[PDB]
Amino acid sequence: QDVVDLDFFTQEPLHLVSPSFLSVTIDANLATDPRFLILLGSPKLRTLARGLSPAYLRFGGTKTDFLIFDPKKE
Amino acid sequence: KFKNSTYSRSSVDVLYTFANCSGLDLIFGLNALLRTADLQWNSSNAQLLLDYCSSKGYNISWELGNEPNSFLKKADIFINGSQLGEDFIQLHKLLRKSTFKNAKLYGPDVGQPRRKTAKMLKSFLKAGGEVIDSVTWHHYYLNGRTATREDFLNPDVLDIFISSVQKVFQVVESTRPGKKVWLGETSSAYGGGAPLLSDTFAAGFMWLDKLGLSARMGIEVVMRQVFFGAGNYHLVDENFDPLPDYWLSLLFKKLVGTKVLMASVQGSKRRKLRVYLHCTNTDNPRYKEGDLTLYAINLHNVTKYLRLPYPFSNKQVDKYLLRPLGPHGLLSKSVQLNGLTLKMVDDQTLPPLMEKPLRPGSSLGLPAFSYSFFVIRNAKVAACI
Numbered sequence: 533q534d535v536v537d538l539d540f541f542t543q544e545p546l547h548l549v550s551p552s553f554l555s556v557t558i559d560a561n562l563a564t565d566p567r568f569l570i571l572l573g574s575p576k577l578r579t580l581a582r583g584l585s586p587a588y589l590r591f592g593g594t595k596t597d598f599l600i601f602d603p604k605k606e
Numbered sequence: 607k608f609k610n611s612t613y614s615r616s617s618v619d620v621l622y623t624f625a626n627c628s629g630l631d632l633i634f635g636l637n638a639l640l641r642t643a644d645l646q647w648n649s650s651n652a653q654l655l656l657d658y659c660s661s662k663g664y665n666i667s668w669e670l671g672n673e674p675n676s677f678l679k680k681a682d683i684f685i686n687g688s689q690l691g692e693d694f695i696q697l698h699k700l701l702r703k704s705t706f707k708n709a710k711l712y713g714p715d716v717g718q719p720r721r722k723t724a725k726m727l728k729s730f731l732k733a734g735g736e737v738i739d740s741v742t743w744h745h746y747y748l749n750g751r752t753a754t755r756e757d758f759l760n761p762d763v764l765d766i767f768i769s770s771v772q773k774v775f776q777v778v779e780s781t782r783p784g785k786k787v788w789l790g791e792t793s794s795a796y797g798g799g800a801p802l803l804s805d806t807f808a809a810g811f812m813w814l815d816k817l818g819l820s821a822r823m824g825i826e827v828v829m830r831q832v833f834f835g836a837g838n839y840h841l842v843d844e845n846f847d848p849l850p851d852y853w854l855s856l857l858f859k860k861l862v863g864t865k866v867l868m869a870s871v872q873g874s875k876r877r878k879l880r881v882y883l884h885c886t887n888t889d890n891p892r893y894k895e896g897d898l899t900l901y902a903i904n905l906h907n908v909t910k911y912l913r914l915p916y917p918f919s920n921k922q923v924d925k926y927l928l929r930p931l932g933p934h935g936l937l938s939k940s941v942q943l944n945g946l947t948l949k950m951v952d953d954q955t956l957p958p959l960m961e962k963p964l965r966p967g968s969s970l971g972l973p974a975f976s977y978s979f980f981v982i983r984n985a986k987v988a989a990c991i
């Protein structure tokens with residue numbers, strides 16, 4: 533048969549995860565895309581991102597260590 | 607291969623407003639390869655950014671470096687873990703002098719704990735561990751270029767994640783006992799993902815299992831590579847349409863609580879039927895304090911029927927079963943919840959996530975190659991109140 537019995541431990545929490553346990557990234561690479569403003573300004577995209585709140589958005593990746601802030605750039 | 611690029615205040619603003627407008631908390635990774643003559647971190651560029659972000663009122667958390675374990679390969683510079691820890695101390699001093707003096711700092715964003723990485727992580731934590739708020743490391747199961755369909759369905763592949771997690775905790779417990787451990791960047795497969803796999807229903811076994819194990823084993827936050835962008839492990843495609851992993855992620859967010867419990871299967875093969883149990887998310891308006899959320903993966907090629915233990919056997923259960931929309935089966939980019947295709951109502955509106963109430967006392971049906979959440983209503987679990 534294909535019937536299976538589950539056992540549950542429910543006496544106490546074994547761990548506590550963050551409310552932001554399921555979080556997401558944007559790769560540093562994306563800041564090299566000429567359309568970065570259009571992309572992250574997307575209302576459709578922001579609606580989808582709001583669905584996963586609360587969460588961290590981590591901006592990083594290999595390009596983290598190949599990106600330099602330039603306050604003169606436009 | 608890797609050349610330096612610049613980014614502007616505009617870019618910083620685009621990123622922050624995206625996070626802020628979306629109710630997300632931005633973590634920004636700083637460039638760790640800016641170095642003085644004697645291999646100390648040169649903080650001058652980061653100081654520029656910190657000042658600018660301070661000036662706009664941006665509440666941001668920080669990292670420094672990505673996979674420092676492979677700096678020698680990427681840029682012919684070797685930074686040992688001791689030095690990196692000192693670099694983090696110097697960043698922490700800059701943050702303490704800034705407008706957000708309590709800003710958080712995470713690192714070192716090492717890869718999975720192979721010998722040399724584990725060594726770098728240990729020496730890093732000895733040196734710089736006092737100043738980080740959480741330890742971050744990264745994980746991918748496979749190279750996207752070679753990964754197979756079978757790999758995405760293989761419990762032996764899924765199980766490798768367990769020893770990575772144990773090894774990271776071994777390092778952390780030997781150096782900074784109790785420091786929180788985060789998966790800082792993680793997905794199915796690197797090289798941008800496995801073509802035709804990482805963006806499909808089949809990707810969900812790896813994603814849900816990783817979440818389940820991470821929660822079970824003590825990882826506090828898991829950061830999915832990637833919400834949106836290049837490759838195909840994205841949650842949201844090039845047309846701003848959600849992929850199956852987005853919908854799985856949304857359901858997880860809505861149903862699964864912060865308090866982690868345990869489930870296991872009697873007879874105890876514990877390979878192809880994978881089960882996880884948390885208290886139900888109390889933010890969900892449908893449910894109440896005490897309720898349980900079970901989630902389960904069936905990697906068998908036949909349906910399995912799960913029986914709940916006493917005292918939960920006769921409770922009302924709400925089923926949230928995900929299956930692919932045809933004709934592409936597990937390689938589909940569309941998913942159904944309890945037989946209803948998941949799709950946006952419009953550009954501003956997520957659809958409702960409609961449960962299927964089961965007959966009280968019934969066994970929980972889990973089709974072949976599927977995953978499901980089950981909310982046990984009126985469970986009245988004291989641990990969850």
Ligand SMILES: CC(=O)N[C@H]1[C@@H](O[C@H]2[C@H](O)[C@@H](O)[C@H](Oc3ccc([N+](=O)[O-])cc3)O[C@@H]2C(=O)O)O[C@H](CO)[C@@H](O[C@@H]2O[C@H](C(=O)O)[C@@H](O[C@H]3O[C@H](CO)[C@@H](O)[C@H](O)[C@H]3NC(C)=O)[C@H](O)[C@H]2O)[C@@H]1O
Binds near residue numbers: 562673791832836838
């Ligand atoms: C979202 C994003 O931009 N992702 C990038 C980025 O992903 C990498 C992360 O930044 C890293 O932190 C992480 O690092 C590691 C390190 C070690 C391990 N490990 O287990 O030992 C794992 C992970 O790796 C991430 C990763 O996914 O590898 O950077 C990678 C590497 O540059 C990007 O991968 C590229 O993706 C391209 C793509 O657009 O899909 C892909 O491009 C080729 O194929 C496409 C087909 O669609 C063509 O259109 C392109 O023209 C073609 N050629 C070129 C030159 O682009 C490319 O092969 C792949 O390297 C990833 O997208």
Ligand SMILES: *[C@@H]1O[C@H](CO)[C@@H](O)[C@H](O)[C@H]1NC(C)=O
Binds near residue numbers: 608609610639640
């Ligand atoms: C990146 O920038 C630093 C300092 O500006 C420099 O030392 C390094 O050689 C640059 N790397 C590449 C790959 O151009």
Ligand SMILES: *[C@@H]1O[C@H](CO)[C@@H](O)[C@H](O)[C@H]1NC(C)=O
Binds near residue numbers: 642643649650
């Ligand atoms: C740090 O980098 C900048 C280059 O942008 C340079 O002008 C400065 O002198 C460097 N500091 C040290 C201590 O090398």
Ligand SMILES: *[C@@H]1O[C@H](CO)[C@@H](O)[C@H](O)[C@H]1NC(C)=O
Binds near residue numbers: 644645686688
């Ligand atoms: C680590 O790196 C620094 C900078 O190169 C060096 O001075 C120091 O001796 C190194 N430490 C170890 C333990 O090798």
Ligand SMILES: *[C@@H]1O[C@H](CO)[C@@H](O)[C@H](O)[C@H]1NC(C)=O
Binds near residue numbers: 907
């Ligand atoms: C399940 O797989 C086995 C062989 O690995 C096969 O013989 C059996 O017929 C399969 N069942 C289904 C329903 O596909």
Ligand SMILES: [Cl-]
Binds near residue numbers: 574627
């Ligand atoms: Cl918006």
Ligand SMILES: [Cl-]
Binds near residue numbers: 716717718744745746
């Ligand atoms: Cl890795």
Ligand SMILES: [Cl-]
Binds near residue numbers: 686725729
């Ligand atoms: Cl090292």
Ligand SMILES: [Cl-]
Binds near residue numbers: 878906
């Ligand atoms: Cl089997």
